[PDB]
């Protein structure tokens, strides 16, 4: 027995890899702000050691602290929210070339937004400020600490 | 058998807590830039699950990828560098109010600088831009991914 990847609690550490990430100029579920996204991203729970592809997770069954994730149906597409404590730390994979989020100046907290089709097609989104790492596609690794439930 | 806390490889995840952190105006082993530092900091290796107090570690025996950490003897004080990939993610403990580093606009990578007395007295330094979390003392939790050896 081990805690599955669809089980999260506050204080967990999430490791996300976004191979061939595309730069989105304005993401709907961020307030129309830039983001990187990949179709075949991978999500890892660092403490437990469990990992799975983002596109192969039933995101309506993912629970944080035993409760379902917050969802936003912007346009006709449903975006799931995975809150973080602190900012999302993303850098170009394999290189020490870091990226900074849109709210680089503020004391706000970031979140991992996922679009899920309902079958097996999921996109992982990371809030960014500009094309500091490139216009895409670019391999990107992220890192974050799982935050509390937005109530 | 388990990998000790004085054993690091690139890609490890470090969880640091800085209880009652003081705001330093200019840190010598940062380019004379602000920092938060704590006397009773704790260091955790998230994947392995090992943790120890920063003041209880022989920092001349801490090895990254089998090689000793880079040291800088600014003034009469020796500071040990633990390189990171990406920026150091630090926030107020227990709250979702996140601090941001000095190089919040650059693609640079941060590091965990440790002053070690040679006995049992160690200070953990986290780069910061201003008193965005306060003048101190303030409980601060940090998060980072261990980077490659600076050659």
């Amino acid at each position, epitope marked *: 027995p081990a805690r599955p990847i669809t089980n999260w609690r506050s204080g967990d550490v999430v490791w996300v890899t976004l191979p061939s990430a*595309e*730069y989105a100029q304005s993401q709907s579920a961020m307030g129309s702000h830039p983001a990187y996204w990949s179709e075949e991203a991978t999500i890892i729970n660092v403490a437990t050691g469990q990992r799975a592809a983002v596109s192969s997770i039933k995101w309506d069954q993912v629970t944080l602290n035993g409760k379902a994730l917050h969802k936003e149906t912007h346009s006709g597409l449903v975006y799931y929210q995975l809150p973080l404590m602190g900012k999302i730390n993303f850098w170009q994979q394999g290189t020490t070339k870091a990226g900074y989020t849109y709210n680089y100046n503020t004391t706000d907290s970031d979140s991992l937004w996922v679009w899920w089709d309902g079958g097996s097609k999921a996109y992982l989104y990371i809030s960014t400020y*500009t*094309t500091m790492l*490139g*216009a*895409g596609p670019v391999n990107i690794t992220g890192l974050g600490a799982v935050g509390p439930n937005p109530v | 058998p388990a990998r000790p806390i004085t054993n690091w490889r690139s890609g490890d995840v470090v969880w640091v807590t800085l209880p009652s952190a003081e705001y330093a105006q200019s840190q010598s082993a940062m380019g004379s830039h602000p920092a938060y530092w704590s006397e009773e900091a704790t260091i955790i290796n998230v994947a392995t699950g090992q943790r120890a107090a920063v003041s209880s570690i022989k920092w001349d025996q801490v090895t990254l990828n089998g090689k000793a950490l880079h040291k800088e003897t600014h003034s009469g004080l020796v500071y040990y560098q633990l390189p990171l990939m990406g920026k150091i993610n630090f926030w107020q403990q227990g709250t979702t109010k996140a601090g941001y580093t000095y190089n919040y606009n650059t*693609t640079d990578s941060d590091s965990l600088w440790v002053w070690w007395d040679g006995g049992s007295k160690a200070y953990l330094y986290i780069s910061t831009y201003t008193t965005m979390l306060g003048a101190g003392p303030v409980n601060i939790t940090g998060l980072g991914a261990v980077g490659p050896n600076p050659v």
Partner: antibody
Amino acid sequence: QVQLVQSGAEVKKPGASVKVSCETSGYTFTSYNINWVRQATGQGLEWMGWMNPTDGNTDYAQKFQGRVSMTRDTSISTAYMELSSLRSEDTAVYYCARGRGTTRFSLQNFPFDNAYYMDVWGKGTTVTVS
Amino acid sequence: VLTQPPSVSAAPGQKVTISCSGSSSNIGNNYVSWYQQLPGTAPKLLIYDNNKRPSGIPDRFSGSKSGTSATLGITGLQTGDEADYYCGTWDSSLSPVVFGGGTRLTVL
């Protein structure tokens, strides 16, 4: 795959206006800027301006401002360029291209870390004037 | 604005480089793409970002950005490399898309 099919060659008198077309396929049309690049025969490439095919927003280079109008038809997924007041130095091949990257441009709003490249090009449209 | 050699020649089996030169607001602050144009053909993306090859571009092509100057590299010259190569980057003062003068890659 993704394609950018343009119109045929045009012969225009000096003083008229030429409208060139660019049909797009294989991708969501209202997702990437449609660029226009000019190249005089014997000269290098020259960016004319992009156009966001979702709000009609366009941004011309500071040489054709007042002589070029870039429109859109999202129903048929066809981008357009118009060039009026055709001078003698306008006999050139006009290219349609799809750009990927940052779209916000101004004199001083984002003066660092700006990546934008033209991924898929057209085939060119030779517009001669005489 | 971006300087570029008018022509570049090399042996049919020799490594050759094509280098541009910009200002602080051209190359030192933004990313520089490279485009290949065969004679009588539309330009084709060769290098995006600074050293990134699209799908289809052989690994012999390479690029690198060091300061306000960036270069285009080749590992081995072939018959089909005889084309015209252009620089492209972001200019925060003039226009988001600026080009170089171009360069002809000939054979000796």
